[PDB]
């Protein structure tokens, strides 16, 4: 069918640490999964946002994960 109740984006696990270098780059640490808002620029770096920040990120320090259900595992 059709889904019209999403409104958001996917995530992507930051495999290592890193920071924003370009004026439009994004920073993150090892384990800081970001929110892929888009995929502009090269086909190797994504576009995402960490709870407020955003910008390009080299996918080599990342992986693309789906939408998880809540974080509380206990």
């Amino acid at each position: 069918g059709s889904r019209r109740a999403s409104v958001g984006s996917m995530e992507a696990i930051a495999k290592y640490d890193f920071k924003a270098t370009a004026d439009d780059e994004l920073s993150f640490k090892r384990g800081d999964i970001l929110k892929v808002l888009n995929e502009e620029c090269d086909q190797n770096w994504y576009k995402a946002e960490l709870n407020g920040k955003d910008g390009f990120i080299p996918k080599n320090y990342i992986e693309m994960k789906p939408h998880p259900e809540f974080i509380v595992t206990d």
């Binding site: 290592y16 190797n44 080299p58 080599n60 320090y61």
Partner: peptide, 15 residues
């Protein structure tokens, strides 16, 4: 090429 470099654009190998 090795691991976590400056992310260079690949091209060819050593052979």
């Amino acid at each position: 090429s090795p691991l976590l470099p400056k992310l260079p654009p690949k091209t060819y190998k050593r052979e």
